[PDB]
């Protein structure tokens, strides 16, 4: 009854242009079977949202990559938050929610905004810049490692480590195997920085360790929760900000609306997160036989959720393929949904808001002016190089 498709959603041809195949995945039915990898797939908004909000049946403790932790060894010790279900998930989640809380955002906002303003002014002096290396990477690198409290030495391992993490959620294709092979130096750097003596007092890392006093996490849990922030907290924002700039470059009408009201910066970033969905996919594992979209899925089955597809499903979104900075974005799944919804979303939105605010106030036009190159990753969608000319306001 369930349709079987040969589409490989982790193929370079799919990454190069995923939208026709995402429509095929939605329109084949509410649930598909992907013969290439022997997993179920759900690509429509309703089912993706339902699965995310059904954690007792669609669990995370057997891994949110293709690999099932009940069957294979995890490539690194499992995340205490991402790869945990309630109740084990609950207190580690509360610790990160407090470390990255509304109140915490007050302590970093002025510096994060100042760094964005200065970066945009610097790029305007250069005029022709690469919006990936010179902006989407440079700006988060200038704020987030410091906000973590990381030392200077070794920071060149952060983005390679994150590329590995996100590649490793994928199937054992060439991207994943090349990522994991000889990755020990990246792992050793990150694991060392998670130990309490290496984290500057006052930064996110030290604050995680300070929560061991409360009973919410033990001392031996704190390094793995620092590791969570060093895994998810940088490369995501690189692709989120990159997506926003690419959107503004492609939709000059929307850049002009943002210039006219820079208070749209935060929703312009949220719409970029829906529109591009920098985190494209991840998995759940069934804990029991379950009916979904009229299909009966057995226990212990991997289910691939297409977040980017759900964020463009015309069943849910009007003009889903348009970038609209005044869209009512609430309900998009680019940050997830339910108990695992991105605990770093206020940090992500802060960075995106203040960069888009700096662009809105300082830049009059953004023109692609060189070869654009895509960056391939089993989980992340974004660009390797985005040459643009920035004209000052
Ligand atoms: C635009 C930027 C970002 C995007 C699109 C994004 C996306 C996501 C998504 C889709 C999930 C859900 C995972 C699941 O349900 O299995 C998630 C969870 C998570 N994210 Fe974000 N993220 C971003 C930025 C960040 C940042 C800046 C941080 C930390 C400073 C962070 C830390 C985390 C953590 C620790 C989790 C696991 C939460 C849990 O399992 O309860 N992320 N993220
Ligand atoms: C979209 C998510 C898969 C991003 C992510 C990655 C890693 C972690 C961790 O806890 O290590 C948490 C969240
Ligand atoms: Cl590691």
Tab-separated table of C-alpha atoms and ligand atoms in Angstrom:
chain	number	residue	atom	x	y	z
A	1	UNK	CA	0.000	0.000	0.000
A	2	UNK	CA	2.801	2.441	0.909
A	3	UNK	CA	4.659	3.850	-2.133
A	4	UNK	CA	8.300	2.835	-2.636
A	5	UNK	CA	10.633	5.500	-4.045
A	6	UNK	CA	14.219	5.235	-5.265
A	7	UNK	CA	15.004	8.907	-4.491
A	8	UNK	CA	18.225	9.280	-2.507
A	9	UNK	CA	17.698	12.368	-0.321
A	10	UNK	CA	21.390	12.317	0.601
A	11	UNK	CA	22.699	12.332	-2.985
A	12	UNK	CA	24.662	15.225	-4.394
A	13	UNK	CA	22.095	15.581	-7.206
A	14	UNK	CA	19.330	15.875	-4.606
A	15	UNK	CA	21.229	18.528	-2.601
A	16	UNK	CA	21.929	20.441	-5.825
A	17	UNK	CA	18.202	20.987	-6.374
A	18	UNK	CA	15.920	19.273	-3.830
A	19	UNK	CA	12.631	20.932	-4.587
A	20	UNK	CA	11.221	18.741	-7.414
A	21	UNK	CA	12.097	15.600	-5.447
A	22	UNK	CA	10.564	17.071	-2.265
A	23	UNK	CA	7.318	17.617	-4.161
A	24	UNK	CA	7.472	14.040	-5.433
A	25	UNK	CA	7.978	12.848	-1.853
A	26	UNK	CA	4.975	14.850	-0.614
A	27	UNK	CA	2.674	13.959	-3.450
A	28	UNK	CA	3.421	10.235	-3.476
A	29	UNK	CA	1.522	9.960	-0.194
A	30	UNK	CA	1.587	10.946	3.469
A	31	UNK	CA	4.170	8.208	4.158
A	32	UNK	CA	6.718	6.775	1.720
A	33	UNK	CA	9.305	4.014	1.860
A	34	UNK	CA	12.788	4.958	0.640
A	35	UNK	CA	14.252	1.739	-0.822
A	36	UNK	CA	17.728	3.249	-1.095
A	37	UNK	CA	18.182	3.268	2.697
A	38	UNK	CA	15.299	1.094	4.001
A	39	UNK	CA	13.621	3.893	5.964
A	40	UNK	CA	10.174	5.448	6.043
A	41	UNK	CA	9.857	9.087	4.988
A	42	UNK	CA	7.321	11.808	5.793
A	43	UNK	CA	7.497	15.013	3.775
A	44	UNK	CA	4.132	16.811	4.281
A	45	UNK	CA	3.706	19.443	6.985
A	46	UNK	CA	0.938	17.705	8.969
A	47	UNK	CA	2.751	14.359	9.341
A	48	UNK	CA	6.166	15.911	10.069
A	49	UNK	CA	4.589	18.047	12.787
A	50	UNK	CA	2.654	15.074	14.181
A	51	UNK	CA	5.747	12.856	14.328
A	52	UNK	CA	7.835	15.530	16.069
A	53	UNK	CA	5.091	15.922	18.679
A	54	UNK	CA	4.718	12.158	19.332
A	55	UNK	CA	7.952	11.353	21.242
A	56	UNK	CA	6.708	8.236	23.060
A	57	UNK	CA	6.268	6.444	19.726
A	58	UNK	CA	8.808	8.291	17.530
A	59	UNK	CA	11.759	8.325	19.899
A	60	UNK	CA	15.178	9.988	19.812
A	61	UNK	CA	17.142	7.695	22.173
A	62	UNK	CA	17.950	5.271	19.332
A	63	UNK	CA	19.579	8.134	17.439
A	64	UNK	CA	18.329	10.949	15.212
A	65	UNK	CA	20.626	9.793	12.406
A	66	UNK	CA	20.134	6.777	10.151
A	67	UNK	CA	22.041	4.557	12.570
A	68	UNK	CA	19.935	2.793	15.222
A	69	UNK	CA	21.808	2.823	18.522
A	70	UNK	CA	20.154	-0.501	19.422
A	71	UNK	CA	21.883	-2.065	16.380
A	72	UNK	CA	25.182	-0.165	15.904
A	73	UNK	CA	27.718	1.594	18.127
A	74	UNK	CA	27.291	5.407	18.164
A	75	UNK	CA	30.251	7.144	16.527
A	76	UNK	CA	30.626	9.263	19.704
A	77	UNK	CA	28.917	8.931	23.120
A	78	UNK	CA	25.222	9.804	22.666
A	79	UNK	CA	24.077	13.335	23.316
A	80	UNK	CA	22.391	13.627	26.738
A	81	UNK	CA	19.744	15.957	25.265
A	82	UNK	CA	19.375	15.374	21.496
A	83	UNK	CA	19.533	11.580	21.770
A	84	UNK	CA	17.492	11.184	24.950
A	85	UNK	CA	13.771	10.816	25.557
A	86	UNK	CA	11.716	12.064	28.520
A	87	UNK	CA	12.276	11.686	31.428
A	88	UNK	CA	16.089	11.410	30.896
A	89	UNK	CA	15.885	14.383	28.506
A	90	UNK	CA	14.146	16.691	30.969
A	91	UNK	CA	16.795	17.972	33.354
A	92	UNK	CA	19.615	18.348	30.762
A	93	UNK	CA	17.087	20.255	28.649
A	94	UNK	CA	16.223	22.511	31.615
A	95	UNK	CA	19.893	23.287	32.221
A	96	UNK	CA	20.483	24.319	28.615
A	97	UNK	CA	17.199	26.227	28.535
A	98	UNK	CA	18.399	28.270	31.530
A	99	UNK	CA	21.945	28.709	30.217
A	100	UNK	CA	20.502	30.026	26.936
A	101	UNK	CA	17.553	31.782	28.581
A	102	UNK	CA	15.810	35.087	27.831
A	103	UNK	CA	17.689	36.616	30.763
A	104	UNK	CA	21.006	35.385	29.352
A	105	UNK	CA	20.274	37.072	26.051
A	106	UNK	CA	20.350	40.431	27.828
A	107	UNK	CA	23.993	39.842	28.796
A	108	UNK	CA	25.227	39.208	25.237
A	109	UNK	CA	22.956	41.378	23.075
A	110	UNK	CA	24.987	44.586	23.056
A	111	UNK	CA	28.207	42.834	22.074
A	112	UNK	CA	26.515	40.625	19.468
A	113	UNK	CA	24.836	43.650	17.873
A	114	UNK	CA	28.049	45.721	17.971
A	115	UNK	CA	30.004	42.930	16.252
A	116	UNK	CA	27.373	42.672	13.502
A	117	UNK	CA	27.311	46.442	12.883
A	118	UNK	CA	31.101	46.559	12.710
A	119	UNK	CA	31.250	43.539	10.367
A	120	UNK	CA	28.797	45.090	7.925
A	121	UNK	CA	30.711	48.391	7.956
A	122	UNK	CA	33.951	46.458	7.373
A	123	UNK	CA	32.459	44.530	4.468
A	124	UNK	CA	31.132	47.756	2.947
A	125	UNK	CA	34.688	49.110	2.840
A	126	UNK	CA	35.689	46.042	0.823
A	127	UNK	CA	32.627	46.167	-1.405
A	128	UNK	CA	33.069	42.765	-3.109
A	129	UNK	CA	33.065	40.018	-0.483
A	130	UNK	CA	32.219	36.349	-0.063
A	131	UNK	CA	29.043	36.268	2.027
A	132	UNK	CA	29.964	32.800	3.338
A	133	UNK	CA	33.606	33.089	4.445
A	134	UNK	CA	33.465	36.865	5.077
A	135	UNK	CA	30.035	37.075	6.711
A	136	UNK	CA	28.001	33.922	7.423
A	137	UNK	CA	31.109	32.239	8.865
A	138	UNK	CA	33.111	35.242	10.045
A	139	UNK	CA	30.360	36.811	12.145
A	140	UNK	CA	29.359	33.726	14.214
A	141	UNK	CA	33.043	32.898	14.615
A	142	UNK	CA	33.570	36.428	16.030
A	143	UNK	CA	30.862	36.078	18.741
A	144	UNK	CA	29.920	32.483	19.567
A	145	UNK	CA	33.282	30.897	20.558
A	146	UNK	CA	33.792	33.879	22.921
A	147	UNK	CA	30.257	33.578	24.322
A	148	UNK	CA	31.000	29.884	24.987
A	149	UNK	CA	34.135	31.008	26.840
A	150	UNK	CA	36.498	29.025	24.598
A	151	UNK	CA	40.231	29.694	24.631
A	152	UNK	CA	41.789	31.000	21.394
A	153	UNK	CA	43.949	27.972	20.614
A	154	UNK	CA	42.300	25.265	18.501
A	155	UNK	CA	39.228	27.147	17.263
A	156	UNK	CA	40.057	26.057	13.704
A	157	UNK	CA	38.574	22.649	14.678
A	158	UNK	CA	35.055	24.005	15.464
A	159	UNK	CA	33.547	24.128	11.995
A	160	UNK	CA	35.217	20.857	10.888
A	161	UNK	CA	33.802	19.189	14.000
A	162	UNK	CA	30.316	20.499	13.296
A	163	UNK	CA	30.503	19.409	9.654
A	164	UNK	CA	31.329	15.926	10.936
A	165	UNK	CA	28.421	15.878	13.421
A	166	UNK	CA	25.883	16.847	10.791
A	167	UNK	CA	27.360	14.533	8.169
A	168	UNK	CA	27.247	11.671	10.667
A	169	UNK	CA	23.448	11.873	11.025
A	170	UNK	CA	23.308	10.752	7.403
A	171	UNK	CA	23.602	7.323	5.852
A	172	UNK	CA	27.009	5.662	5.417
A	173	UNK	CA	27.708	7.404	2.091
A	174	UNK	CA	30.980	9.038	1.029
A	175	UNK	CA	30.180	12.314	2.819
A	176	UNK	CA	29.744	10.436	6.105
A	177	UNK	CA	32.701	8.080	5.725
A	178	UNK	CA	35.100	10.862	4.759
A	179	UNK	CA	33.828	12.940	7.696
A	180	UNK	CA	34.352	10.201	10.316
A	181	UNK	CA	37.674	8.876	9.035
A	182	UNK	CA	40.652	10.633	10.696
A	183	UNK	CA	38.238	12.810	12.700
A	184	UNK	CA	40.060	12.062	15.979
A	185	UNK	CA	41.925	15.419	16.083
A	186	UNK	CA	38.613	17.321	15.802
A	187	UNK	CA	37.019	15.132	18.473
A	188	UNK	CA	40.033	15.495	20.798
A	189	UNK	CA	39.966	19.281	20.583
A	190	UNK	CA	36.224	19.577	21.274
A	191	UNK	CA	36.229	17.001	24.070
A	192	UNK	CA	39.134	18.796	25.793
A	193	UNK	CA	37.377	22.184	25.683
A	194	UNK	CA	34.306	20.651	27.362
A	195	UNK	CA	36.251	20.150	30.614
A	196	UNK	CA	35.585	22.812	33.241
A	197	UNK	CA	39.149	24.275	33.546
A	198	UNK	CA	39.150	25.157	29.836
A	199	UNK	CA	35.977	27.307	29.908
A	200	UNK	CA	36.082	31.007	30.760
A	201	UNK	CA	34.048	31.942	33.847
A	202	UNK	CA	30.840	33.585	32.785
A	203	UNK	CA	30.539	31.968	29.335
A	204	UNK	CA	27.948	29.374	28.355
A	205	UNK	CA	30.320	26.465	29.003
A	206	UNK	CA	31.204	27.504	32.537
A	207	UNK	CA	27.551	28.224	33.266
A	208	UNK	CA	26.661	24.638	32.266
A	209	UNK	CA	29.252	23.382	34.766
A	210	UNK	CA	27.893	25.749	37.425
A	211	UNK	CA	24.547	23.931	37.192
A	212	UNK	CA	26.122	20.741	38.551
A	213	UNK	CA	25.714	22.336	42.009
A	214	UNK	CA	21.895	22.309	41.720
A	215	UNK	CA	21.198	18.611	41.295
A	216	UNK	CA	19.918	19.106	37.768
A	217	UNK	CA	23.007	17.498	36.173
A	218	UNK	CA	25.973	15.666	37.677
A	219	UNK	CA	29.557	16.872	37.113
A	220	UNK	CA	30.136	14.048	34.628
A	221	UNK	CA	27.148	15.190	32.534
A	222	UNK	CA	28.369	18.764	32.113
A	223	UNK	CA	31.108	18.078	29.486
A	224	UNK	CA	28.628	16.335	27.161
A	225	UNK	CA	26.188	19.245	27.458
A	226	UNK	CA	28.973	21.722	26.595
A	227	UNK	CA	29.657	19.358	23.670
A	228	UNK	CA	26.022	19.772	22.567
A	229	UNK	CA	26.499	23.538	22.260
A	230	UNK	CA	29.795	23.107	20.426
A	231	UNK	CA	28.080	20.633	18.088
A	232	UNK	CA	24.898	22.531	17.252
A	233	UNK	CA	25.588	26.132	18.044
A	234	UNK	CA	27.909	27.371	15.284
A	235	UNK	CA	27.441	25.623	11.921
A	236	UNK	CA	23.647	25.979	12.162
A	237	UNK	CA	23.904	29.746	12.537
A	238	UNK	CA	26.441	29.922	9.672
A	239	UNK	CA	23.889	28.332	7.387
A	240	UNK	CA	21.003	30.306	8.875
A	241	UNK	CA	22.674	33.658	8.280
A	242	UNK	CA	23.962	32.468	4.909
A	243	UNK	CA	20.418	31.503	3.931
A	244	UNK	CA	19.114	34.944	4.925
A	245	UNK	CA	21.743	36.782	2.844
A	246	UNK	CA	21.143	34.491	-0.124
A	247	UNK	CA	17.420	35.180	0.213
A	248	UNK	CA	17.949	38.928	0.357
A	249	UNK	CA	20.328	38.718	-2.627
A	250	UNK	CA	17.704	36.836	-4.669
A	251	UNK	CA	14.638	38.859	-3.557
A	252	UNK	CA	15.659	42.550	-3.844
A	253	UNK	CA	12.055	43.617	-3.209
A	254	UNK	CA	12.284	42.048	0.242
A	255	UNK	CA	15.612	43.697	0.995
A	256	UNK	CA	13.927	46.995	0.185
A	257	UNK	CA	11.041	46.269	2.569
A	258	UNK	CA	13.543	45.323	5.299
A	259	UNK	CA	15.495	48.563	4.713
A	260	UNK	CA	12.267	50.517	5.102
A	261	UNK	CA	11.494	48.865	8.459
A	262	UNK	CA	14.504	47.294	10.150
A	263	UNK	CA	12.243	46.020	12.927
A	264	UNK	CA	11.309	43.303	10.436
A	265	UNK	CA	14.844	41.916	10.898
A	266	UNK	CA	13.802	39.173	13.300
A	267	UNK	CA	10.946	37.914	11.148
A	268	UNK	CA	13.070	38.244	8.001
A	269	UNK	CA	15.488	35.808	9.620
A	270	UNK	CA	12.716	33.451	10.749
A	271	UNK	CA	11.350	33.406	7.195
A	272	UNK	CA	14.830	32.565	5.877
A	273	UNK	CA	14.904	29.642	8.323
A	274	UNK	CA	11.542	28.386	6.975
A	275	UNK	CA	12.421	29.120	3.328
A	276	UNK	CA	15.835	27.446	3.183
A	277	UNK	CA	15.563	25.198	6.257
A	278	UNK	CA	19.294	25.036	7.053
A	279	UNK	CA	18.626	21.817	8.992
A	280	UNK	CA	16.969	19.757	6.252
A	281	UNK	CA	16.329	16.362	7.838
A	282	UNK	CA	16.743	14.041	10.749
A	283	UNK	CA	15.318	10.772	11.980
A	284	UNK	CA	13.178	9.203	14.677
A	285	UNK	CA	12.923	5.484	15.549
A	286	UNK	CA	9.580	3.783	16.233
A	287	UNK	CA	9.196	2.239	19.706
A	288	UNK	CA	6.083	0.245	18.759
A	289	UNK	CA	3.944	-0.605	15.767
A	290	UNK	CA	2.198	2.596	14.729
A	291	UNK	CA	-0.185	3.750	12.015
A	292	UNK	CA	0.803	7.004	10.302
A	293	UNK	CA	-0.836	8.388	7.173
A	294	UNK	CA	-2.754	5.133	6.812
A	295	UNK	CA	0.508	3.167	6.725
A	296	UNK	CA	1.381	0.637	9.426
A	297	UNK	CA	5.010	1.001	10.545
A	298	UNK	CA	6.566	-1.729	12.649
A	299	UNK	CA	8.575	-1.293	15.820
A	300	UNK	CA	12.229	-0.362	15.554
A	301	UNK	CA	11.905	1.374	12.168
A	302	UNK	CA	13.752	4.548	11.179
A	303	UNK	CA	11.579	7.443	10.011
A	304	UNK	CA	13.160	10.277	8.018
A	305	UNK	CA	11.493	13.667	8.549
A	306	UNK	CA	11.827	16.250	5.751
A	307	UNK	CA	11.770	19.576	7.621
A	308	UNK	CA	12.530	21.687	4.542
A	309	UNK	CA	9.732	19.952	2.625
A	310	UNK	CA	7.281	20.464	5.484
A	311	UNK	CA	8.271	24.159	5.450
A	312	UNK	CA	7.327	24.386	1.741
A	313	UNK	CA	4.244	22.140	1.736
A	314	UNK	CA	1.491	24.061	-0.145
A	315	UNK	CA	-1.116	22.173	1.933
A	316	UNK	CA	0.048	24.412	4.827
A	317	UNK	CA	1.743	27.481	3.253
A	318	UNK	CA	0.494	30.037	0.771
A	319	UNK	CA	3.096	30.708	-1.929
A	320	UNK	CA	5.547	28.417	-0.104
A	321	UNK	CA	8.338	29.095	-2.616
A	322	UNK	CA	8.307	32.864	-2.007
A	323	UNK	CA	10.531	34.593	0.540
A	324	UNK	CA	8.139	36.949	2.400
A	325	UNK	CA	9.559	38.767	5.398
A	326	UNK	CA	6.099	39.642	6.740
A	327	UNK	CA	4.804	36.048	6.510
A	328	UNK	CA	3.233	34.632	9.657
A	329	UNK	CA	5.978	32.028	10.171
A	330	UNK	CA	4.655	30.536	13.423
A	331	UNK	CA	4.448	26.779	13.139
A	332	UNK	CA	7.359	26.293	10.745
A	333	UNK	CA	9.524	23.296	11.732
A	334	UNK	CA	12.950	24.719	10.850
A	335	UNK	CA	13.792	24.750	14.572
A	336	UNK	CA	11.886	21.524	15.198
A	337	UNK	CA	8.760	21.215	17.314
A	338	UNK	CA	7.770	19.737	20.661
A	339	UNK	CA	10.050	18.571	23.449
A	340	UNK	CA	13.272	18.814	21.401
A	341	UNK	CA	12.515	22.156	19.731
A	342	UNK	CA	15.835	23.964	19.344
A	343	UNK	CA	16.958	24.969	22.808
A	344	UNK	CA	19.406	27.396	21.184
A	345	UNK	CA	16.733	29.254	19.202
A	346	UNK	CA	17.175	32.505	21.117
A	347	UNK	CA	20.901	32.563	20.355
A	348	UNK	CA	20.220	31.753	16.681
A	349	UNK	CA	17.538	34.437	16.388
A	350	UNK	CA	19.667	36.994	18.213
A	351	UNK	CA	22.557	36.539	15.753
A	352	UNK	CA	20.253	36.537	12.737
A	353	UNK	CA	18.274	39.543	13.931
A	354	UNK	CA	21.281	41.751	14.651
A	355	UNK	CA	23.017	40.867	11.373
A	356	UNK	CA	19.872	41.525	9.344
A	357	UNK	CA	19.350	44.747	11.298
A	358	UNK	CA	22.875	45.876	10.397
A	359	UNK	CA	22.222	45.042	6.716
A	360	UNK	CA	18.845	46.801	6.809
A	361	UNK	CA	20.355	50.035	8.137
A	362	UNK	CA	23.619	50.100	6.172
A	363	UNK	CA	23.228	48.333	2.802
A	364	UNK	CA	21.241	49.548	-0.211
A	365	UNK	CA	21.744	46.560	-2.492
A	366	UNK	CA	23.161	43.023	-2.482
A	367	UNK	CA	24.166	41.724	-5.928
A	368	UNK	CA	25.541	38.259	-6.588
A	369	UNK	CA	28.694	38.964	-8.544
A	370	UNK	CA	30.716	35.763	-8.781
A	371	UNK	CA	30.333	31.982	-9.091
A	372	UNK	CA	28.011	30.583	-6.425
A	373	UNK	CA	29.003	27.215	-4.943
A	374	UNK	CA	26.923	24.871	-2.815
A	375	UNK	CA	28.314	23.184	0.297
A	376	UNK	CA	27.221	19.550	0.574
A	377	UNK	CA	26.310	17.972	3.898
A	378	UNK	CA	24.016	15.063	4.734
A	379	UNK	CA	21.944	17.247	7.119
A	380	UNK	CA	22.771	20.929	6.568
A	381	UNK	CA	21.763	22.946	3.510
A	382	UNK	CA	23.855	25.964	2.597
A	383	UNK	CA	26.494	27.529	0.382
A	384	UNK	CA	30.269	27.142	0.168
A	385	UNK	CA	30.798	30.505	-1.564
A	386	UNK	CA	28.440	33.406	-2.279
A	387	UNK	CA	30.297	36.306	-3.908
A	388	UNK	CA	28.295	39.501	-3.578
A	389	UNK	CA	28.811	43.198	-4.110
A	390	UNK	CA	27.449	45.306	-1.220
A	391	UNK	CA	26.378	48.848	-2.076
A	392	UNK	CA	26.203	51.217	0.920
A	393	UNK	CA	22.971	52.965	1.887
B	1	LIG	C1	19.456	28.782	12.532
B	1	LIG	C2	20.084	28.062	13.490
B	1	LIG	C3	19.575	26.707	14.040
B	1	LIG	C4	18.717	25.808	13.496
B	1	LIG	C5	17.990	25.864	12.114
B	1	LIG	C6	18.544	24.737	14.460
B	1	LIG	C7	17.760	23.610	14.294
B	1	LIG	C8	17.461	22.683	15.271
B	1	LIG	C9	16.465	21.644	15.159
B	1	LIG	C10	15.597	21.380	13.902
B	1	LIG	C11	16.456	20.953	16.309
B	1	LIG	C12	15.539	19.757	16.673
B	1	LIG	C13	16.282	18.427	16.733
B	1	LIG	C14	15.384	17.217	16.942
B	1	LIG	O1	14.154	17.376	17.092
B	1	LIG	O2	15.908	16.054	16.966
B	1	LIG	C15	17.437	21.547	17.192
B	1	LIG	C16	17.766	21.141	18.473
B	1	LIG	C17	18.846	21.625	19.216
B	1	LIG	N1	19.612	22.754	18.949
B	1	LIG	FE1	19.279	24.061	17.368
B	1	LIG	N2	19.332	25.011	15.559
B	1	LIG	C18	19.971	26.207	15.351
B	1	LIG	C19	20.807	26.839	16.233
B	1	LIG	C20	21.223	26.356	17.453
B	1	LIG	C21	22.098	27.037	18.379
B	1	LIG	C22	22.653	28.467	18.151
B	1	LIG	C23	22.285	26.227	19.437
B	1	LIG	C24	23.103	26.459	20.727
B	1	LIG	C25	23.661	27.634	21.104
B	1	LIG	C26	21.538	25.015	19.197
B	1	LIG	C27	21.484	23.920	20.032
B	1	LIG	C28	20.561	22.896	19.942
B	1	LIG	C29	20.414	21.776	20.854
B	1	LIG	C30	21.298	21.509	22.108
B	1	LIG	C31	19.384	21.029	20.428
B	1	LIG	C32	18.832	19.748	21.097
B	1	LIG	C33	17.617	20.192	21.949
B	1	LIG	C34	16.847	18.985	22.482
B	1	LIG	O3	17.077	17.821	22.005
B	1	LIG	O4	16.014	19.201	23.416
B	1	LIG	N3	20.898	25.126	17.981
B	1	LIG	N4	18.025	22.597	16.531
B	2	LIG	C1	19.121	19.710	14.289
B	2	LIG	C2	19.891	19.006	15.403
B	2	LIG	C3	20.231	17.580	14.921
B	2	LIG	C4	21.124	19.827	15.776
B	2	LIG	C5	21.897	19.226	16.962
B	2	LIG	C6	23.135	18.601	16.786
B	2	LIG	C7	23.819	18.076	17.886
B	2	LIG	C8	23.249	18.194	19.148
B	2	LIG	C9	23.935	17.622	20.378
B	2	LIG	O1	23.268	17.567	21.452
B	2	LIG	O2	25.132	17.216	20.305
B	2	LIG	C10	22.015	18.813	19.330
B	2	LIG	C11	21.333	19.328	18.230
B	3	LIG	CL1	33.245	14.525	20.321
